[PDB]
Design an enzyme around this catalytic site. Sequence first.
Site, PDB file in Angstrom:
ATOM      1  N   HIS A  41      60.029  10.908 -75.614  1.00  0.00           N
ATOM      2  CA  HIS A  41      60.491   9.536 -75.366  1.00  0.00           C
ATOM      3  C   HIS A  41      61.629   9.121 -75.696  1.00  0.00           C
ATOM      4  O   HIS A  41      61.584   8.309 -75.612  1.00  0.00           O
ATOM      5  CB  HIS A  41      59.860   9.015 -75.900  1.00  0.00           C
ATOM      6  CG  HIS A  41      59.295   9.398 -77.319  1.00  0.00           C
ATOM      7  ND1 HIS A  41      59.885   9.089 -78.675  1.00  0.00           N
ATOM      8  CD2 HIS A  41      57.649  10.025 -78.161  1.00  0.00           C
ATOM      9  CE1 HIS A  41      59.468   9.610 -79.600  1.00  0.00           C
ATOM     10  NE2 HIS A  41      58.295  10.336 -79.478  1.00  0.00           N
ATOM     11  N   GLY A 143      60.104   6.243 -87.251  1.00  0.00           N
ATOM     12  CA  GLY A 143      61.612   7.052 -87.182  1.00  0.00           C
ATOM     13  C   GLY A 143      61.502   8.612 -87.952  1.00  0.00           C
ATOM     14  O   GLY A 143      62.694   9.411 -87.972  1.00  0.00           O
ATOM     15  N   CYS A 145      59.840  10.474 -85.731  1.00  0.00           N
ATOM     16  CA  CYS A 145      59.271  10.788 -84.561  1.00  0.00           C
ATOM     17  C   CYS A 145      60.731  12.809 -84.876  1.00  0.00           C
ATOM     18  O   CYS A 145      61.509  11.919 -85.316  1.00  0.00           O
ATOM     19  CB  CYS A 145      59.870  10.637 -83.425  1.00  0.00           C
ATOM     20  SG  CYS A 145      58.622   9.231 -83.512  1.00  0.00           S
TER      21      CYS A 145
HETATM   22  C1  2RI Z   1      59.490   8.046 -83.800  1.00  0.00           C
HETATM   23  C2  2RI Z   1      59.867   7.336 -82.065  1.00  0.00           C
HETATM   24  O1  2RI Z   1      60.939   7.405 -84.350  1.00  0.00           O
HETATM   25  C3  2RI Z   1      58.609   6.998 -84.467  1.00  0.00           C
HETATM   26  O2  2RI Z   1      58.193   6.573 -85.297  1.00  0.00           O
HETATM   27  N1  2RI Z   1      57.314   6.460 -83.514  1.00  0.00           N
HETATM   28  C4  2RI Z   1      57.575   6.263 -82.030  1.00  0.00           C
HETATM   29  C5  2RI Z   1      58.399   5.086 -81.406  1.00  0.00           C
HETATM   30  C6  2RI Z   1      58.268   4.876 -79.849  1.00  0.00           C
HETATM   31  C7  2RI Z   1      57.217   5.643 -79.394  1.00  0.00           C
HETATM   32  C8  2RI Z   1      56.909   7.229 -80.021  1.00  0.00           C
HETATM   33  C9  2RI Z   1      56.116   6.926 -81.881  1.00  0.00           C
HETATM   34  O3  2RI Z   1      56.185   7.970 -78.940  1.00  0.00           O
HETATM   35  C10 2RI Z   1      56.317   7.064 -77.792  1.00  0.00           C
HETATM   36  C11 2RI Z   1      56.311   7.340 -76.614  1.00  0.00           C
HETATM   37  C12 2RI Z   1      57.279   6.485 -75.436  1.00  0.00           C
HETATM   38  C13 2RI Z   1      57.362   5.601 -75.423  1.00  0.00           C
HETATM   39  C14 2RI Z   1      57.764   4.906 -76.638  1.00  0.00           C
HETATM   40  C15 2RI Z   1      57.661   6.009 -77.809  1.00  0.00           C
HETATM   41  C16 2RI Z   1      56.416   4.933 -84.981  1.00  0.00           C
HETATM   42  C17 2RI Z   1      55.000   4.967 -83.588  1.00  0.00           C
HETATM   43  O4  2RI Z   1      54.098   6.138 -83.125  1.00  0.00           O
HETATM   44  N2  2RI Z   1      54.524   4.092 -83.076  1.00  0.00           N
HETATM   45  C18 2RI Z   1      53.233   4.115 -82.650  1.00  0.00           C
HETATM   46  C19 2RI Z   1      52.362   2.273 -82.731  1.00  0.00           C
HETATM   47  C20 2RI Z   1      53.711   3.964 -80.761  1.00  0.00           C
HETATM   48  C21 2RI Z   1      52.165   4.669 -80.578  1.00  0.00           C
HETATM   49  C22 2RI Z   1      52.056   4.884 -79.427  1.00  0.00           C
HETATM   50  C23 2RI Z   1      53.531   4.501 -78.062  1.00  0.00           C
HETATM   51  F1  2RI Z   1      54.354   5.652 -76.963  1.00  0.00           F
HETATM   52  C24 2RI Z   1      54.727   3.944 -79.002  1.00  0.00           C
HETATM   53  C25 2RI Z   1      54.164   3.497 -80.588  1.00  0.00           C
HETATM   54  C26 2RI Z   1      55.437   6.540 -85.217  1.00  0.00           C
HETATM   55  C27 2RI Z   1      55.280   5.224 -86.787  1.00  0.00           C
HETATM   56  C28 2RI Z   1      54.600   5.773 -87.778  1.00  0.00           C
HETATM   57  C29 2RI Z   1      54.545   7.758 -87.708  1.00  0.00           C
HETATM   58  N3  2RI Z   1      54.858   8.512 -86.796  1.00  0.00           N
HETATM   59  C30 2RI Z   1      56.141   7.292 -85.608  1.00  0.00           C
END
Ligand code: 2RI
Lengths: 301, 305
Positions: A41, A143, A145
């Site tokens: 992603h 951040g 991920c």
């Molecule tokens: C990563 C990018 O570092 C991150 O921390 N988080 C994240 C952000 C955007 C994402 C994601 C994960 O997974 C995907 C898949 C497809 C498109 C975008 C994207 C965030 C996080 O998970 N935020 C939540 C709101 C989320 C859930 C699902 C989603 F599709 C997007 C965003 C995070 C925050 C706290 C701990 N871990 C990860």
Amino acid sequence: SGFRKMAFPSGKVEGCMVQVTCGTTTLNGLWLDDVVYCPRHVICTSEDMLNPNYEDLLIRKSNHNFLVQAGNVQLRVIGHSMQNCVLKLKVDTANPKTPKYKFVRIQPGQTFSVLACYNGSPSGVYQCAMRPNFTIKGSFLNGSCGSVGFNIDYDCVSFCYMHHMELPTGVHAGTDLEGNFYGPFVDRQTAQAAGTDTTITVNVLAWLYAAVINGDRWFLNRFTTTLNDFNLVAMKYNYEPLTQDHVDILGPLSAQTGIAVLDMCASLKELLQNGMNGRTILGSALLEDEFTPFDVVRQCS
Amino acid sequence: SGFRKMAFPSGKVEGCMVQVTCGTTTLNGLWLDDVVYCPRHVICTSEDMLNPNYEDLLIRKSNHNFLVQAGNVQLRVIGHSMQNCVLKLKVDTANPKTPKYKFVRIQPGQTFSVLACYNGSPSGVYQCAMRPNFTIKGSFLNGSCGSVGFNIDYDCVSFCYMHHMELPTGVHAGTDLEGNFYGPFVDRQTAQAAGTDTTITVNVLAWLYAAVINGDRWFLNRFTTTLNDFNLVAMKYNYEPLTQDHVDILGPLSAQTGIAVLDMCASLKELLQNGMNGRTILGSALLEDEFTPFDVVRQCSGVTF
Ligand SMILES: *[C@](C)(O)C(=O)N(c1ccc2c(c1)oc1ccccc12)[C@@H](C(=O)N[C@@H](C)c1ccc(F)cc1)c1cccnc1
Ligand SMILES: *[C@](C)(O)C(=O)N(c1ccc2c(c1)oc1ccccc12)[C@@H](C(=O)N[C@@H](C)c1ccc(F)cc1)c1cccnc1
Ligand code: NA
């Protein structure tokens, strides 16, 4: 003596963390030999996070759309491919710090260390478990991920988790290093929810044995039970069923302590009915379930 | 989201661990630059335990009485000296894996990561605190001696602990890297007990702030107490006194959460007397006291090394 949530030494993984940037998204990647692994992603955009078409997005990316940074050395991407939900970036330089490693997919109940990372840099290391609902109860911020989970039994690193997202309940979802999600989760922002979690019963029992080994006796009792009646009791407390495999697995800890598994099962039953009564077991006031039978022996023997 | 017992990344300390042997005793040492640090009881034999003379036993030993293996590769000792309870073995090779470090002595209530080692090999890492009674509730087995505790700041490793022994009650005792014991203990075979332990009040408060930041708020109440009123409640329940400096250190977390320290103290007072109502805080059913205010700011903001 003593019992701690003990992680593995993180040095072998620290030398593998790099920083991966695509578009406006910067997250962590895992550099092994001449491949950088990271959540796919990273090629997603703010406008299309609900239903990205990853095959279509990746073919439009050139190698130069990926900024990979190991410390202050830029690494050059010379190819890319997708394996399920993991992106594999081929780079021109092999990681001189690649440890002996393997990729392993674990089962619910298994435990592993997590090296929480931000911008390719390590923040800290903790113990974690694959929950029965296939989430993990981690400590992750925006951040993180690309952060990985691993064990290091006997000088070999076993990578078993890559972090991909945080669910609305605040627990976390991710994949093995072949890109396959643990559980029914998908790397999109569509409404998805963890199932009701349950307690890892074989791990609780392993932990009570560790408690006995360290000199606690107070939860013991003179009763024993059948596997079937214990399972009837289990299900009423949201506990995972206990199987014959689990009983066999608890064999060695049973022999070390002289307490038959089903005898320890009767103790667990009583604790569930009564609680702690102001007491602790190995310094906790709850029944711990993120220590496996293998963890107990590791740290007690 | 989430809150775990988080240790510092241990990579910089792993590269300094070596095996030290003197006679039959084998334990761990810390290889920094061209000196290897280890517990001085490595020169004791089992007849020497009751009341050992470290001065004498050391003079009458040669540089090569000390097998120092860095992995499979033998380190040649070229000198030795004693400082308090630590043995310093100068060697002919500077550790190419020496990080930026310094030696620090920590205060009771302060936390560090322990890298538990056996036969010069790192096997585990975990977080723990210097108890008010100067013991640590570690996890160590036979052979663990010489394992070290440390903190990291930016890129500097602060070494604060070296493991010497386990007490009869199962807790652990050791020194700083200058060989000064924490607490009223001695490195010989004798009956040793520590003073009664107490709960690190300022860390419990820090931990409640961590729970609030993580949306766990059932314990919050509308009330505010005073320093003196809380300090008597603290004595009754065997809590460390809470000082104005403790209140100051918690200032950041106060600003972030909107909960003044003496507000939280009313919450802690109420938990101390009324139990925890069958409920949990950050996934625990007791008052966690091994997270400093800085530990909370680290997990909750993502400070990196
Ligand atoms: C990563 C990018 O570092 C991150 O921390 N988080 C994240 C952000 C955007 C994402 C994601 C994960 O997974 C995907 C898949 C497809 C498109 C975008 C994207 C965030 C996080 O998970 N935020 C939540 C709101 C989320 C859930 C699902 C989603 F599709 C997007 C965003 C995070 C925050 C706290 C701990 N871990 C990860
Ligand atoms: C060390 C050698 O690695 C070790 O594990 N333990 C130990 C053994 C012998 C020791 C010692 C510590 O401290 C001293 C001082 C003087 C002479 C010998 C000696 C053991 C351990 O601590 N065993 C206890 C029973 C002990 C205490 C004091 C003593 F004098 C002898 C033995 C250990 C076991 C588990 C965790 N940490 C340390
Ligand atoms: Na950046």
